[PDB]
């Protein structure tokens, strides 16, 4: 938006336990949205943090302070127990950032946690030392707004900004002692939604029909769940990254969310179809390699589909992709359809050591790629030598002795009598784990009736691996479809990257980043985003639809796949934080407009 | 009257009884 909006002296504090302290998905959100925050706020954009050694040392160069006030807040709360450190985030933007050490102001946690039961009625054990750090995190927080609203000598609007649960005690404490702060607090997952998930008893289906305390207490974890509802409660204004996130928070946290504010990017132009030809090429190599002595089928007609993210199997939907997979093989074996679909599993999980057969094909491929370029080579000087005699060429003679030698080796190493290995390491649990499990299952097994092939990379693509040195993000560049059909998803950053990058995707509308996709799009699968219906879908259904969406997919031409891809990179800039920052920005009127009804006035 | 403050350590708290999340937002609310 470019809204006309009074932010003259209006300071913002963006409180996070993600700032500077890389221990989730949260800090790639605060890590790209300093950018379109400090051009809108200036100097008066600050990121309140827990310090840590590491990402102080590696992340935050340490300044003085820029305003009287602000270091009159620093050296009381310095001379009064604790240590706060003031820096610069060293990132696009270089959001000043006020660093506060837990663990020195620990001295006064017991009682503080007397406050806590003097104002909010919230206990928690001493057991839980995540719960404790948050606890001390939010006092600290308190402290520091009163402080810097005392020392100010002409008193701002402050508005705070808390982020998940850890940072919500302050917020709770904020707004026990009467600060004129305007709090905004957002979720990026609800609290009792992971483990409720975990329990596969129907979450989404049973969202009515849950008791939030009793399942706390079945999962100890009462004091949480409390802290982030009276979070949620206590915020002048509550949003949210999804609607469906939204829906959970409405249905557990019992308040309906006022804005949605889903995560963007800094979207940067990563044109899409020279990085996909090489990616491709690179990729067909690897699966040349890979199965080596059983390339019987066309590698012109080859899908590449994949699926990325943390290991979750239920989660993240793998055992609907692989379900669907062996379906969508069923399909093309019996309609004969001469198309292949190599299914990547890029899910990192504990290995031992690179597999044997895969390193061998790898090598393999090396040394043919080597011979044939050698043959290659002095075949062309010869045929160049030739051609300027003036002799059109013999070629029963232009290979010598030396070239058949070497051919002949090379397809002595071709020679293969098993078949190609699913995973590419060595997993030091085969029988624990569920994707091999699922394959074996299914019947997956990479032979040469089957139309699907299943390649599982437990790692995360690098530079410097031996089988396939090119990252994530060149990798997927050059696959032809992401498959995401994920079921607990609070926005979905791995297919965001993908559309951001290009690839069309299959998403869900139980993931945020599908909702948001499905209401911003009239046709979805015009532009390259599947969504499955997983909301309302049994299982078997769910795994029909997706099996429907990969056949379809696969019958397309390359011409559709073409103006499919091209609609895709269109969609780009629908997730740049150009256009999601209005949700936030909305979201800050509010507050100011609810805690400063005076001062402030904001038209929905 | 710290006597259900001291329920409140060790994760021995009745999610349903006395400590339950109604008197938690009563006590947020006056204070609002």
Redesign the interface.
Same mark, same amino acid.
């Given at each position: 938006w470019e809204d006309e909006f009074d932010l003259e002296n209006a300071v913002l504090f963006e409180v996070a336990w993600e700032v500077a302290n890389k221990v989730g998905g949260i800090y790639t959100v605060l890590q790209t949205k300093a950018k379109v925050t400090g051009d809108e706020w200036g100097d008066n954009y600050f990121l309140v943090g827990p310090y840590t050694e590491q990402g102080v040392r590696t992340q935050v160069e340490l300044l003085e302070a820029p305003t009287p006030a602000l270091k009159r807040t620093l050296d009381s709360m310095n001379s009064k127990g604790c240590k706060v450190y003031f820096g610069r985030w060293l990132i696009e933007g270089g959001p000043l950032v006020v660093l506060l050490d837990v663990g020195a102001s620990a001295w006064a946690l017991e009682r503080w946690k007397?406050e806590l039961?003097d104002?909010?009625?919230?206990?928690?054990?001493?057991?839980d030392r995540e719960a404790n750090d948050a606890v001390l995190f939010g006092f600290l927080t308190t402290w520091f707004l009163g402080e810097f609203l005392a020392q100010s000598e002409e008193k701002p609007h402050v508005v705070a900004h808390f982020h998940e649960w850890l940072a919500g005690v302050g917020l709770?404490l904020c707004?026990?002692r009467r600060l004129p702060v305007a709090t905004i607090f957002t979720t990026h997952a609800t609290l009792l939604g992971r483990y409720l998930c975990a329990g596969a008893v129907d979450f989404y289906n049973n969202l009515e029909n849950f008791?939030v305390?009793?399942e706390?207490?079945e999962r100890?974890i009462?004091?949480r769940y409390?802290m982030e509802?009276?979070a949620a409660?206590?915020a002048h204004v509550f949003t949210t990254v999804s609607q469906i996130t939204a829906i959970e928070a409405q249905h557990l946290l019992k308040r309906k969310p006022d804005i949605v504010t889903p995560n963007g990017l800094n979207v940067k132009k990563f044109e899409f179809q020279n990085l996909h030809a090489q990616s491709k090429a690179r990729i067909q190599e690897f699966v040349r390699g890979h199965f080596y002595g059983h390339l019987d089928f066309n590698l012109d007609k080859t899908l590449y589909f994949f699926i990325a993210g943390r290991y979750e199997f239920s989660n993240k939907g793998a055992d609907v992709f692989l379900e669907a997979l062996a379906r969508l093989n069923y399909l093309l074996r019996v309609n004969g359809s001469e198309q292949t679909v190599v299914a990547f599993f890029i899910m990192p999980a504990r290995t031992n050591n690179f597999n044997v057969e895969t390193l061998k094909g790898q090598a393999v491929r090396k040394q043919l790629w080597d011979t044939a370029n050698t043959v290659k080579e002095k075949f062309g000087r010869k045929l160049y030598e030739s051609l300027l005699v003036g002799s059109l060429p013999d070629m029963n003679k232009m290979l010598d002795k030396e070239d058949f030698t070497m051919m002949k080796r090379a397809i002595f190493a071709t020679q293969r009598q098993s078949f190609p290995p699913v995973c590419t390491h060595n997993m030091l649990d085969d029988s624990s784990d569920p994707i091999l499990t699922t394959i074996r299952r299914i019947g997956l097994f990479n032979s040469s009736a089957d139309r699907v092939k299943v390649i599982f990379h437990p790692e995360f693509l690098s530079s410097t691996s031996p089988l396939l040195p090119v990252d994530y993000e060149e990798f997927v560049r050059g696959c032809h479809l992401g498959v995401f059909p994920s079921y607990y998803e609070p926005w979905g950053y791995t297919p965001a990257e993908c559309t951001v990058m290009g690839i069309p995707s299959i998403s869900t509308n139980l993931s945020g980043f599908g909702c948001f996709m499905e209401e911003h799009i009239a046709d979805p699968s015009a532009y390259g985003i599947y969504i499955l219906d997983r909301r309302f879908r049994s299982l078997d259904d769910s795994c029909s639809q997706l099996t429907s969406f990969l056949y379809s997919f696969c019958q397309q031409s390359r011409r559709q796949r073409i103006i499919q891809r091209n609609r895709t990179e269109r969609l780009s800039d629908l997730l740049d934080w150009k256009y999601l920052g209005r949700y936030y920005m909305s979201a800050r009127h509010m507050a100011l407009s609810k805690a400063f009804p005076e001062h402030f006035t904001y038209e929905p | 009257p710290?006597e259900?403050?001291r329920?409140?350590?060790?994760?021995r708290?009745d999610?349903?009884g006395k400590?339950?999340?109604a008197?938690?937002?009563e006590? &947020?609310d006056r204070? &609002?």
């Open positions: 007397g039961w104002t909010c009625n919230i206990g928690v054990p001493w057991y709770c707004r026990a008791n305390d009793k706390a207490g100890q009462y004091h409390c509802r009276a409660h206590c | 710290e259900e403050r329920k409140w350590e060790e994760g708290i999610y349903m400590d339950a999340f008197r938690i937002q006590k &947020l204070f &609002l």
